[PDB]
RNA sequence: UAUAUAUAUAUAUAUAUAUAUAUAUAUAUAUAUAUAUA
RNA sequence: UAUAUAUAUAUAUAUAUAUAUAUAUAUAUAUAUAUAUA
């Protein structure tokens, strides 16, 4: 098959990375956590503290205009959210209509990679066995 | 027979009935349908305590062996597996465990339970992984079960009903009285024992259940245990016990069959087991009979003529059989044995074996004994958990043993890479061509033609469909707000909706949703796998356009694609009989699995760069079906690069190689297993349904015609065979239709190959094969196996294992259908009987219990009321189920050829005729005035007494409910309708056509006053049809099925004495037989197993008409004026008007407004108009003017002829001069032909001529109601 | 009682198939001997 | 210890010959039953 220079997938990844310096003002952070109810956690042998409902950060993105991101971060992704996680704490996700990139508002900014991770790991107190469930997903401001 | 005294009353009268004993009535017939409603199912069993049975059988008790559930199931990657127990990776069907634990207590039934509603909570809920296990189990397990068309135990009192009491023998000097006797079936005494272990005291509890939703099963007592593999078990015995009677085998081969089940039984995997030693009975049988010295008989001289690409056949007389034509293959006893020997099965084939040695010489014995042996594999529709299905067939990649080196290509074409010239071999084959059959399709005025446009178009919608949610979300995605009509209630997965969704789309901004996902789906099989379902969506459907036009230019201009036109399929009925005459030899071939070993890194990169460069003759700036034409970058100069337009076809493939490359991503969400939907991408071609037919067509053509013409000669080593092998060519020596092909040997001089050349030659066909990864799985049996079609010495063997009476597939949970759609279940369970060719007095017996049971239902609302129906008999009549015995007549004399419809009636009412008037006169006080068929005796009363009328009248009662519509939903609907409209008519001049002819049509017939009201077929309607198939695949509301049952009650009840216009005109004709007529074939050469002097009436009519269709004058009325149309309307309907049209002598102008109503334009429309004349028109053609059609049935005879020159309309010194149709003649005549033929067709026996005696009124008063009728209509 | 026809059984002859034994040939495996190499 | 070659023995498979047993077909004889005639 045809090939395509390999230089167009970096500037796609990492061209955006590139123009931080050159910005004028800090970085705003964001991520688009899916939520947890503790229920299945302690029904896997978790011990966790606090009935509200665990959630873990998928993916973060920065953006640096805190008004329009505001006003950008209503829209509900129609994209559910597959957590599995085993008690080894290897933690996966799956999105079952898959995330296009182009649904992401020009105006963001992703990392190359990411690893997902509990928001707080201190809500749990001991691993159960391993663990699934499905959940929304909904862009959120961090701090 | 005591059996006899333990039925209940009724029953015991729909015995006698059914025995031939009396005339059945409604009375009984409600008291035996309604009392089996009611009583519950275990009864049937119970009944087996009255058969002293006298069989060697014994049950083991290793069936009661439950081995645990919970070690064959497990999660990983959140998906549940099958996890095999043996090292065999294809163990992954359902095992046989205890089903037990699982179940709850009902409380409408507390003795059968279904699963804990703990479990399903906690798997649906916490995803809990054993509960998700078991709930897969269960779901399974179930499904397994509902794989029937109703429940088995019916079925079983249907076969003890019939069974119960011999039938009365008719005058006929053929009619020999069953052989076969009950104590003697070893599937009943089996039945018997392994019964006897679910009694508690005397009750005989069911194993299982089948529901609407499932199957439910019985909670053990704290002793037992239910193993699931038991009712599979049972379905199979019940199966074979049916089918072992009306085939009439002797009880030994039956034998074999129980501890076949048995020994598959006994060990895990019931499923598996079976699967695994499947073709044992076809080797040991089929592919072995007449290897020994005693060989002869007579076999049939089948011509194969001149032009063989019209693949027409003419039987030329008989062959005397010797030793010297005897099968040469090696046979097939010693790989069958070694494979029983695993089972310690090896008594079974000691038996075939000893009992085959019985017949070495081909006769009727012979192949009747092949029929019964090999309908002794079971029957079940096999089923495994979808998952495991997509992930064991999908995760398959060719194995290519010369790949093309990567120095092979030129520079990129932006996606494509040209082949250099300087590569040979089958590649470079492949490669010209496609790419020679591109060019032909480059330049072609056919296309861009506005019909031929609306064509395509239309082909692509239908009312099943998928992917609908994958093209919603990608199109939404890039920002394009689809429409919605949701109020218009309508499927949004159908493939109408969202087509109706891209009408108003500019074409290229939809090229981003081909990288799409595509839904999938599972259908059940027989004796395989199951098939794959992957219905892309309509813009993919589109996109892939040049693929399939250049395969089908390939078919069509080479080796005719091998009768995939799929005209008639009988086609393939003499190709295989010739196929099998001694003179021949016949090699079955097929590509291990074509859909997996087609694939891009090999195959779909030359095709595409073979249609790219192909395409490079024609316009550069020349849009095709809105695709425009773009500008690429052209690299196979590495000094001079550069970029040049190429033309919308070129840009088609340039997309989709780059979507083949990418490889198709299916997504899975099976409902049987538990929460565990999920997508991967695979090389598999789709091959969902016979589009992609063209594709494997053609490359399975033209790799073989390179291995013939060039490998071969090239490698094989044996001199005899080099000459013998040239002078050979595909398109007279192989056949195809995607996998499945067929090779035959030009007939060698006297005599026959030798197996060693054959095995060299076979040997390197697998070779080749190999080389770029098609397993061929060839075989040499000297026998024909082509579209699941076999054929013995010319002789055609129906494989009835195939069409198991009990089963049925079903490929969701719920059965999701309503009660009286049973009724055409039966209808085309019936038929399958007489296409295949059973022992006709029996199965008509049969047939009959099954319908009684069928001919009563109900239905209770959602909350609130209950409803109740049933049909009076005489329905089944006009469905086409023959009667058997009439008040005043003797039993069994109407044959199962009999036509369904109105023909059915008229024939009986002819034949029944004289009594019926001659008894009404005695019984009935005359009519006030007279009649024109019937005298003063008022017979019409005495035909409601028997409820003729509403039997005939309820039959035409609709069975499916009518959804209903809404105003905001008919803006939808407009909206719906608007846009199919735009999408049909996307340019204008086909817009204008149809409005003129439109609007001239109607202005014509009212002024010229034809008629108004005349539904003509037209454009306009075609998205109407559309939209109701779309409301119509809804599942329906409960109001529908009220006014359903209301209705069809009150047609029931409503006293009316007359049938339809046609019907009442018929009668006004009488027919008479007069001797038989001379024979076609020798009655002593066999042509169908089962057809033989045993089976007489099968028997009588295959010999006196022959089974070669051979209308070497008629063609069958295939040569319809309008070719070319458009999908929605029906071209039966189209020329049935225009002949009725030039029969009422219309103007032209009313054909040119007729034929402008469906497009064609003015200049063909009066070329077409011209053509029409009652001259070239065939005897069907103009017959089906007044919906006089030929049954299905008479399919696979030669009734040309005998319609031509045997049955006479006007014999001078028979016939009344009244009925002399004088001119009308023309179009009088065939219309008695057909009510003549199917009269003598509807009576058993021999074949006779068939001739008019007598019109009551002047065969001019009939022409002039005719010709009334037809201008109403 | 006799004749003729049909069915069943038994005996004898002939043909065909299968099984078992023995002989001869060929192939494969294992053991032993001899030669050669390591 | 291993590999290769040759000889001998044993086992298994295939082919051919001979013997025995069993099954099927055909012919002849005898017995028994049923039908028809005398």
């Not at chain 2, 005693?294 to 019209?310: C, H, L, N, Q, V």
């Not at chain 2, 007489?834 to 006709?840: E, P, S, Y």
């Not at chain 2, 009519?1101 to 009325?1117: H, M, Q, V, W």
């Amino acid at each position: 098959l045809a090939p395509t220079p390999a230089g167009r997938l970096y500037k796609q990844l990492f061209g955006p990375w590139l123009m931080v310096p050159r910005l004028s003002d800090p970085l705003i952070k964001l991520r688009l956590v899916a939520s947890a109810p503790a229920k299945v956690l302690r029904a896997a042998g978790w011990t966790i503290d606090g009935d509200p409902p665990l959630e873990v950060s998928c993916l973060c993105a920065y953006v640096t205009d805190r008004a329009m991101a505001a006003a950008l971060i209503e829209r509900r992704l129609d994209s559910r959210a597959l957590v599995n996680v085993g008690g080894d704490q290897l933690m996966f996700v799956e999105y079952a209509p898959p995330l296009p990139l182009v649904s992401i508002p020009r105006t963001f900014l992703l990392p190359v990679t990411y690893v997902v991770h509990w928001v707080s790991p201190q809500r749990v107190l001991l691993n159960g066995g391993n663990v699934s469930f499905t959940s929304g997903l909904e862009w959120t401001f961090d701090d | 027979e005591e059996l006899f005294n333990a039925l209940p009353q009724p029953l015991q009268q729909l015995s006698l009935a059914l025995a031939g004993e009396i005339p059945l009535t409604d009375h009984i017939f409600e008291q035996a349908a309604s009392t089996w409603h009611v009583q519950p199912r275990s009864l049937t069993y119970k009944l087996l305590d009255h058969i002293p049975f006298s069989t060697p059988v014994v049950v083991p008790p290793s069936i009661y062996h439950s081995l645990d559930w919970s070690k064959c199931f497990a999660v990983n990657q959140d998906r549940v597996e099958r996890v095999p127990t043996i090292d065999d990776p294809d163990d992954v069907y359902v095992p046989n465990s205890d089903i037990g634990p699982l179940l709850t207590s009902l409380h409408t039934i507390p003795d059968y339970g279904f699963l804990h509603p703990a479990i399903e909570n906690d798997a649906t809920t916490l995803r809990a992984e054993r509960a998700r296990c078991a709930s897969t189990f269960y779901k399974i397990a179930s499904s397994q079960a509902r794989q029937v068309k109703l429940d088995p135990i019916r079925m079983l009192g249907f076969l003890l009903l019939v069974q119960a009491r011999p039938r009365v023998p008719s005058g006929l000097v053929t009619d020999q009285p069953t052989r076969r006797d009950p104590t003697q079936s070893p599937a009943l005494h089996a039945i018997w024992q392994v019964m006897q272990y679910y009694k508690v005291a005397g009750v005989y509890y069911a194993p299982a259940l089948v529901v609407p939703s499932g199957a439910i099963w019985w909670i053990p007592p704290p002793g037992k245990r239910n193993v699931v593999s038991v009712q599979y078990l049972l379905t199979d015995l019940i199966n074979l016990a049916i089918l072992a009677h009306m085939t009439d085998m002797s009880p030994t081969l039956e034998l074999t069959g129980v501890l076949m089940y048995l020994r598959a039984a006994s060990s895990h995997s019931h499923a598996y087991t079976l699967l695994q030693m499947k073709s044992v009975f076809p080797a040991l049988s089929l592919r072995s009979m007449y290897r020994n010295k005693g060989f002869g008989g007579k076999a049939p001289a089948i011509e194969w003529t001149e032009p063989r690409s019209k693949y027409k056949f003419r039987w030329t007389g008989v062959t005397q059989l010797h030793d010297g034509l005897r099968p040469r293959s090696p046979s097939m006893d010693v790989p069958t044995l070694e494979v029983l020997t695993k089972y310690e099965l090896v008594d079974i084939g000691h038996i075939i074996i000893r009992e085959r040695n019985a017949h070495p010489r081909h006769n009727h014995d012979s192949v009747r004994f092949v029929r019964d042996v090999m309908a002794l594999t079971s029957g079940m529709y096999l089923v495994r958990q979808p998952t495991m299905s997509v992930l064991r067939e999908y995760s398959q990649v060719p194995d290519i043993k010369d790949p093309i080196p990567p120095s092979a290509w030129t520079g990129p074409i932006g996606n494509v890479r040209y082949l250099l010239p300087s590569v040979q071999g089958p590649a470079r084959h492949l490669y010209d061509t496609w790419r020679a059959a591109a060019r032909q399709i480059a330049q072609d005025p056919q296309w861009h033609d506005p019909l031929n446009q609306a064509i395509m178009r239309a082909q692509y919608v239908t009312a099943r469909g998928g992917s609908s949610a994958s093209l919603k979300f990608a199109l939404k995605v890039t920002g394009i707000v689809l429409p919605e009509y949701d109020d218009s209630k309508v499927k949004k997965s159908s493939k109408i909706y969202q087509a109706a969704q891209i009408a108003r789309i500019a074409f290229m901004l939809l090229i981003a949703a081909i990288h799409a996902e595509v839904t999938m789906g599972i259908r059940n099989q027989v004796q395989r796998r199951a098939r794959s379902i992957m219905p892309l969506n309509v813009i993919q459907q589109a996109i892939s356009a040049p693929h399939t036009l250049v395969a089908n230019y390939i078919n069509k201009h080479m080796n005719l694609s091998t009768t995939s036109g799929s005209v008639v399929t009988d086609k393939v009925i003499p190709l295989i009989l010739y196929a099998s005459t001694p003179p021949n030899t016949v090699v079955n071939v097929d590509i291990k699995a074509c859909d997996a070993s087609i694939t891009y890194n090999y195959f779909l990169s030359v095709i595409c760069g073979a249609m790219h460069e192909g395409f490079e003759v024609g316009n550069a700036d020349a849009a095709f079906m809105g695709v425009p034409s773009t500008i690429v970058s052209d690299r196979r100069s590495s000094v001079a690069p550069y970029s040049r337009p190429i033309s919308g076809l070129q840009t088609m493939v340039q997309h989709l190689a780059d979507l083949y490359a990418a490889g198709f991503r299916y997504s899975v969400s099976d409902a049987f297993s538990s929460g565990n939907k999920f997508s991967f991408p695979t090389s598999t071609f789709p091959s969902g349904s016979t589009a992609t037919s063209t594709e494997h067509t053609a490359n399975n053509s033209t790799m073989m015609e390179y291995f013939l013409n060039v490998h071969a000669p090239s490698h094989v080593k044996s001199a005899s065979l080099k000459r013998i092998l040239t002078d050979m060519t595909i398109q007279r020596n192989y056949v195809c239709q995607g996998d499945d092909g067929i090779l035959l040997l030009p007939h060698e001089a006297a005599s026959k190959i030798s197996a060693d050349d054959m095995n060299e030659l076979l040997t390197c066909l697998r070779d080749y094969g190999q080389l770029f990864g098609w397993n061929y799985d060839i075989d040499w049996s000297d026998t024909a196996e082509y579209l699941k079609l076999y054929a013995l010495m010319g002789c055609r063997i129906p494989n009835t294992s195939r069409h198991p009476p009990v089963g049925k597939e079903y490929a969701a949970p719920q059965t999701d259908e309503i009660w009286p759609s049973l009724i055409d279940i039966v209808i085309g369970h019936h038929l399958n009987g007489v296409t295949d060719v059973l022992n006709w007095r029996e199965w008509l017996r049969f047939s009959w219990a099954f319908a009684c049971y069928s001919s009563r239902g109900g239905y209770t609302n959602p909350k609130g009321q209950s409803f109740s129906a049933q049909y009076p008999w005489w329905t089944f009549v006009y469905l086409g189920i023959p009667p058997i015995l009439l008040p005043g007549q003797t039993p069994f004399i109407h044959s199962c050829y009999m036509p369904p419809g109105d023909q059915g009636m008229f024939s009986i009412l002819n034949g029944w005729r004289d009594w019926l008037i001659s008894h009404a006169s005695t019984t009935l006080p005359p009519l006030r005035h007279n009649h024109p068929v019937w005298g003063l005796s008022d017979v019409p009363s005495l035909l409601s007494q028997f409820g003729v009328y509403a039997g005939y009248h309820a039959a035409q009662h609709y069975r499916r409910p009518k959804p209903a519509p809404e105003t905001a939903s008919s803006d939808s609907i407009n909206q719906i309708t608007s846009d199919l409209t735009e999408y049909l008519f996307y340019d204008s001049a086909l817009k204008a056509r149809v409005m003129k002819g439109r609007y001239n049509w109607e202005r014509l017939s009212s002024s010229l006053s034809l008629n108004v009201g005349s539904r003509v077929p037209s454009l306009f309607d075609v998205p109407g049809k559309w939209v109701a198939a779309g409301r119509d695949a809804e599942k329906p509301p409960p109001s529908s099925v009220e006014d359903m049952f209301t209705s069809l009650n009150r047609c029931i009840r409503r006293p009316t004495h007359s049938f339809s216009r046609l019907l009442e005109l018929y009668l006004r004709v009488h027919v008479t037989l007069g001797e038989s007529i001379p024979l076609a074939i020798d009655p002593d050469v066999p042509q169908v197993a089962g057809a033989d002097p045993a089976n007489d009436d099968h028997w009588f009519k295959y010999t006196c008409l022959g089974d070669i269709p051979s209308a070497t004058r008629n063609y069958f009325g295939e040569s319809l004026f309008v070719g070319r149309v458009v999908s929605g309307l029906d071209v039966e309907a189209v020329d049935a008007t225009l002949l009725r049209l030039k029969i009422l002598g219309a103007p032209p102008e009313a054909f040119i407004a007729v034929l402008n109503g469906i497009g064609m334009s003015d200049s063909e429309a009066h070329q077409i108009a011209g053509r029409i004349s009652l001259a070239n028109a065939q005897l069907v053609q103009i017959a089906r003017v007044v919906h006089l059609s030929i049954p299905s049935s008479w399919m696979t005879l030669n009734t040309g002829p005998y319609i031509h020159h045997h049955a006479y309309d006007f014999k001078p010194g028979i016939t009344q001069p009244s009925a002399k149709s004088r001119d009308k003649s023309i179009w009088m005549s065939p219309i008695l032909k057909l009510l003549c033929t199917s009269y003598a067709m509807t009576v058993a026996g021999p074949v006779r001529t068939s001739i008019v005696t007598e019109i009551d009124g002047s065969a001019a008063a009939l022409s002039g109601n005719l010709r009334v009728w037809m201008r109403d209509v």
